[PDB]
């Protein structure tokens, strides 16, 4: 659901700050994709509960902050 090349660029850019000039297996990038998608989808399914609890229809960032607090991060 997220474009492969942009995500691979981003993950490489982030990795750069721990140590330069890492190479990556493509399967590792796919694993990162699947993990990140799963995490985001879960976080949305969670925060939607907070949104409907506040009797909203929209998601608002207050709700993300709340969710991240309650699950603990």
């Amino acid at each position: 659901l997220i474009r492969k090349l942009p995500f691979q660029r981003l993950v490489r850019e982030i990795a750069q700050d721990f140590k330069t000039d890492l190479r990556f297996q493509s399967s590792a990038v796919m694993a990162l994709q699947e993990a990140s998608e799963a995490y985001l989808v879960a976080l949305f399914e969670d925060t939607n509960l907070c949104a409907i609890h506040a009797k909203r229809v929209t998601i608002m960032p207050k709700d993300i902050q709340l969710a991240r607090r309650i699950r603990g991060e």
């Binding site: 660029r9 890492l22 590792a28 993990a35 990140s36 608002m60 960032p61």
Partner: protein
Amino acid sequence: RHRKVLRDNIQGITKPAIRRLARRGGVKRISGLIYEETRGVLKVFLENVIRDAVTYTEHAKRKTVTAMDVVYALKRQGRTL
């Protein structure tokens, strides 16, 4: 002209993709503020998992990150999650 080159990486996650994810997450409507907010969260998640993955690969004196190292990072993250 050549000057049309530009760079910004984090925007590679963009509103249509975030929309798709939210719709998969059953969301009805979203404020625009969410787009930058979720990007922050996503960076932190990446930040943590990469830190583990690289630390595996450097302990093995590798130059290449493998899917095995990644999945061991996830097996730590999800249980610590």
